[PDB]
Design an enzyme around this catalytic site. Structure first.
Site, PDB file in Angstrom:
ATOM      1  N   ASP A 166      -0.391   5.029   0.825  1.00 17.46           N
ATOM      2  CA  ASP A 166      -0.705   6.006   1.866  1.00 17.46           C
ATOM      3  C   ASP A 166      -0.637   5.362   3.246  1.00 17.46           C
ATOM      4  O   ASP A 166      -1.326   4.384   3.503  1.00 17.46           O
ATOM      5  CB  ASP A 166      -2.090   6.594   1.640  1.00 17.46           C
ATOM      6  CG  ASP A 166      -2.147   7.514   0.438  1.00 17.46           C
ATOM      7  OD1 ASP A 166      -1.313   8.442   0.362  1.00 17.46           O
ATOM      8  OD2 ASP A 166      -3.025   7.304  -0.430  1.00 17.46           O
TER       9      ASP A 166
ATOM     10  N   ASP B 213       0.842  -1.174   0.000  1.00 13.21           N
ATOM     11  CA  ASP B 213       0.000   0.000   0.000  1.00 13.21           C
ATOM     12  C   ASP B 213       0.902   1.258   0.000  1.00 13.21           C
ATOM     13  O   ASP B 213       2.074   1.198   0.396  1.00 13.21           O
ATOM     14  CB  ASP B 213      -0.869  -0.078   1.246  1.00 13.21           C
ATOM     15  CG  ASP B 213      -1.573   1.200   1.541  1.00 13.21           C
ATOM     16  OD1 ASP B 213      -0.947   2.090   2.152  1.00 13.21           O
ATOM     17  OD2 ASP B 213      -2.760   1.300   1.176  1.00 13.21           O
TER      18      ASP B 213
ATOM     19  N   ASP C  89      -2.132  -0.972   5.801  1.00 11.33           N
ATOM     20  CA  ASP C  89      -2.463  -0.293   7.040  1.00 11.33           C
ATOM     21  C   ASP C  89      -3.962  -0.059   7.270  1.00 11.33           C
ATOM     22  O   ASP C  89      -4.354   0.295   8.379  1.00 11.33           O
ATOM     23  CB  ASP C  89      -1.710   1.039   7.142  1.00 11.33           C
ATOM     24  CG  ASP C  89      -2.382   2.155   6.352  1.00 11.33           C
ATOM     25  OD1 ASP C  89      -2.677   1.958   5.155  1.00 11.33           O
ATOM     26  OD2 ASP C  89      -2.628   3.237   6.931  1.00 11.33           O
TER      27      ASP C  89
HETATM   28  O1  LIG Z   1      -9.019   6.743   1.506  1.00 15.63           O
HETATM   29  C1  LIG Z   1      -8.068   7.495   1.788  1.00 15.63           C
HETATM   30  O2  LIG Z   1      -7.748   7.678   2.979  1.00 15.63           O
HETATM   31  C2  LIG Z   1      -6.965   7.612   0.773  1.00 15.63           C
HETATM   32  C3  LIG Z   1      -5.943   6.510   1.030  1.00 15.63           C
HETATM   33  O3  LIG Z   1      -6.638   5.256   1.058  1.00 15.63           O
HETATM   34  O4  LIG Z   1      -7.458   7.485  -0.567  1.00 15.63           O
HETATM   35  C4  LIG Z   1      -8.182   8.615  -1.039  1.00 15.63           C
HETATM   36  O5  LIG Z   1      -7.665   9.822  -0.464  1.00 15.63           O
HETATM   37  C5  LIG Z   1      -6.372  10.257  -0.924  1.00 15.63           C
HETATM   38  C6  LIG Z   1      -6.030  11.625  -0.330  1.00 15.63           C
HETATM   39  O6  LIG Z   1      -5.780  11.497   1.076  1.00 15.63           O
HETATM   40  C7  LIG Z   1      -6.331  10.359  -2.434  1.00 15.63           C
HETATM   41  O7  LIG Z   1      -5.002  10.756  -2.816  1.00 15.63           O
HETATM   42  C8  LIG Z   1      -6.733   9.024  -3.050  1.00 15.63           C
HETATM   43  O8  LIG Z   1      -6.760   9.214  -4.459  1.00 15.63           O
HETATM   44  C9  LIG Z   1      -8.123   8.658  -2.562  1.00 15.63           C
HETATM   45  O9  LIG Z   1      -9.021   9.671  -3.032  1.00 15.63           O
HETATM   46 MG   LIG Z   2      -3.160   3.090   3.106  1.00 19.05          MG
END
Ligand SMILES: O=C(O)[C@@H](CO)O[C@H]1O[C@H](CO)[C@@H](O)[C@H](O)[C@@H]1O
Ligand SMILES: [Mg+2]
Lengths: 252, 250
Positions: free
Chosen positions: A8, A6, A202
């Site tokens: 983020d 993953d 995560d």
């Molecule tokens: O769900 C979220 O917390 C994040 C990571 O999973 O994804 C969204 O949020 C992100 C922004 O925090 C975007 O960059 C992704 O494209 C998506 O829209």
């Molecule tokens: Mg993540």
């Protein structure tokens, strides 16, 4: 061995930069161990991070291969070949309108919002927000906590699937990180190398990843999912710890 | 006599025009009775209805006069003179961002949404939603039930005022239908004509309008506020009625 990870909150720090996991990725790259991003992010976000295919975007919605991947699959996009596993965004967005009717309350996602608005909600720059809005499969929902149960029931009522990515819920149809990982492993041009898969994640959207791999590692802040290995620190420090303490030993 | 009237469900039927009030208006035109729309709609929305100034838009935020109005007031703007009574939209939006911080939660409004989103929200067409998005004074908020009270508290903490327009909350500073009515009456060329004012309205959102006029008539679904006349049938069927029962005999 192949490492599926993953982005983020796993391989990326709080802002959205790869910095802290650089040496960890360095080690894997030097040992010739393939690392494949599997993320909720769009192809445009991934590209801006400078990452090359193969990678999986939008919670498993799309698998992007190199144009010269030795196994033929998907359709040409200049430098890519694309394997679509999920319904297209346009179709999800239409089905969301039906859901909103059932819920009797607006259901907003990124598609409803300006880049400026998305940038304020997410802490992203306006430019990064435009890239987060360029979605091909999955919609990011912006929900009020108090309405979540209602909204999620309305999604399932109209045949959509939902998941949660760390901060936002997402709606899609056919987008599963596990299904996309399984497909990629089957399209891998070296069967031996793809025999042993490692998965790091995560959040909720990573559960199907943990079921699709041979060694699962949780780097989130909660407690690990049932019978999944965990790390002393979350995030990239978690990633580094897993590489040094779980992977390398198995590679020597 | 001057007639001040809300457009939603007063002059305008459920469809979006005015059937039964059409002859009622032509009649008023015949006896030379000025009719002044007082609405939450934007000037772009009002122009698309083919309405001529004077009119009052955005809940009393702006008073639009003919450029050649006999009383010099407001700032020239093409074929209009504009009397601004409220803070400008951009200033309201800036304050909304402070309120978000105090509230610790996002506050969404039309300014954050695409026209397609606004259209789906309001049941309007895309082109009509672009017109609804062209706001000069007040913001329309898309809030959720459980956070409304925290948000409203936040809005008032940063110096904004709020109203409920029937479907959505609205935030502004200085927009009040009553104040715009009082100001137009003060700017009326023929003071004798402005002496008697009638107000026709939907919902309690018109209560400030009802207070600023001499004869108030309610054509909404609920129960008329204290001190307001009422009609059997609502809408332009109540407008028509009120006009032949309360007005035409004068
Ligand atoms: O769900 C979220 O917390 C994040 C990571 O999973 O994804 C969204 O949020 C992100 C922004 O925090 C975007 O960059 C992704 O494209 C998506 O829209
Ligand atoms: Mg993540």
């Amino acid at each position: 061995m192949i490492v599926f990870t993953d982005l983020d909150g796993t391989l990326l720090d709080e802002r959205g930069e790869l910095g802290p996991a650089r040496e960890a990725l360095e080690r894997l790259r030097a040992l010739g161990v393939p690392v494949v991003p599997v993320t909720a992010k769009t192809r445009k976000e991934v590209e801006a991070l400078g990452l090359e295919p193969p990678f999986i975007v939008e919670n498993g919605g799309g698998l992007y291969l190199p144009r010269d991947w030795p196994v033929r699959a998907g359709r040409p996009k200049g430098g890519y070949r694309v394997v679509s596993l999920a319904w297209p965004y346009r179709k999800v967005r239409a089905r969301l309108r039906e859901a909103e009717a059932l819920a009797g309350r607006p259901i907003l996602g990124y598609g409803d919002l300006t880049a400026e608005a998305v940038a304020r909600l997410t802490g992203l720059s306006r430019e990064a927000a435009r890239r987060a809005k360029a979605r091909e499969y999955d919609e990011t929902l912006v929900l009020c906590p108090e309405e979540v149960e209602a909204v999620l029931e309305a999604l399932e009522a109209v045949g959509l699937e939902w998941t949660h990515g760390g901060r936002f819920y997402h709606a899609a149809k056919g987008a599963d990180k596990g299904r996309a990982v399984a497909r990629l492993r089957a399209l891998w041009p070296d069967p031996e190398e793809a025999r042993f898969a490692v998965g790091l994640g995560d959040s909720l959207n990573d559960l199907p990843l943990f079921r699709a791999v041979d060694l699962a590692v949780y780097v989130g802040r909660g407690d690990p999912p049932e019978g999944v290995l965990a790390t002393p620190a979350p995030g990239p420090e978690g990633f580094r710890y897993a590489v040094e303490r779980y992977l390398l030993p198995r590679l020597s």
